Amino acid sequence: VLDGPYQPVAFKPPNDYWILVNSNSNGVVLEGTNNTDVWVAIISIEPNVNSESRQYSLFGVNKQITVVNTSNKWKFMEMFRNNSNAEFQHKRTLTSSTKLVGILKHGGRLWTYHGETPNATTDYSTTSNLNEISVTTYAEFYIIPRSQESKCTEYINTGL
Numbered sequence: 001v002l003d004g005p006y007q008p009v010a011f012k013p014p015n016d017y018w019i020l021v022n023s024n025s026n027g028v029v030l031e032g033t034n035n036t037d038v039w040v041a042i043i044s045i046e047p048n049v050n051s052e053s054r055q056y057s058l059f060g061v062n063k064q065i066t067v068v069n070t071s072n073k074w075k076f077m078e079m080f081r082n083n084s085n086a087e088f089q090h091k092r093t094l095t096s097s098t099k100l101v102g103i104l105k106h107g108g109r110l111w112t113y114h115g116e117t118p119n120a121t122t123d124y125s126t127t128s129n130l131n132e133i134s135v136t137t138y139a140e141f142y143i144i145p146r147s148q149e150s151k152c153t154e155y156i157n158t159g160l
Contacts (some may be wrong), residue, residue, distance in 0.1 A: 001151065002143030004116065012134040015105045018144040021137050022160070023099045029139060030101060033072045038110060038125060041088065043077040045069040055098035058088060065090075073097045078123060094120055097157055098159040102155075105130050106146055118157040122149075127141055143158055 004055045005022065010023040013019055013032045023044050041066065050098035051068040058079065065088070073095050079092035094101065094113040102122075104111040109124040110133060127133070144152045 001148075002144065002155075005140040006137075006142070008137050008139060008141075010074055010134060010136040012132075013103075013132065015145040018102050018104045018146060018149065019135060019137065019141050020144055020152060020155060021101045021103075021139050021141040023074075023076070023101055023139050023141075028058065028136065030103060030135065031059060032103060032110070032133050032135040033059060034127065034129045034134070035084070036127075036129045036132065037082045038127045038129075038133055039081045039084075039088070040091075040103075040110065040112075042103075042112070043067070045075040045077060047072045047074060049075075056143050057114060063088065069095075070095075070160075071095060072105065073117070074099050076101050076142045076155050078114065085103075092123060093123075096120065096156070097104045098156065100159065101127050102152060102156055103135060104146060105133060113153075113156050121153070 026046045075092040078092035079088040095116040
């Protein structure tokens, strides 16, 4: 049912496969880019963090990012930009008790999860250059075909 776990690598995911990362620590879980119009990084924040500034290496650059998470769940912050000259924006949030995060390339679009477990759902960013998006994971991950997406969304929301 679940292909993995693979060790952390940089690679170019094929289309229509969910990459499901089993995050452990509170740093950058995941980052991806095609070097033309998508840079995305997913940042993990542990439970019960009052508002403060933390530093993260995004694509080899130390960046200052304001974080907060007053819940008892982990927070995964989806940072995004579409221009190599811009700064990252906190685009989306996944609030999770499972610590599992997803990214998929499908239909000209880049898909992640957001919301609150157990009712987290997918959303998208657009691109003209989907197939050049490569992904560097910083924790162990599994591969799921999009045809099995409902299982992926179960994992995301209820764990392994």
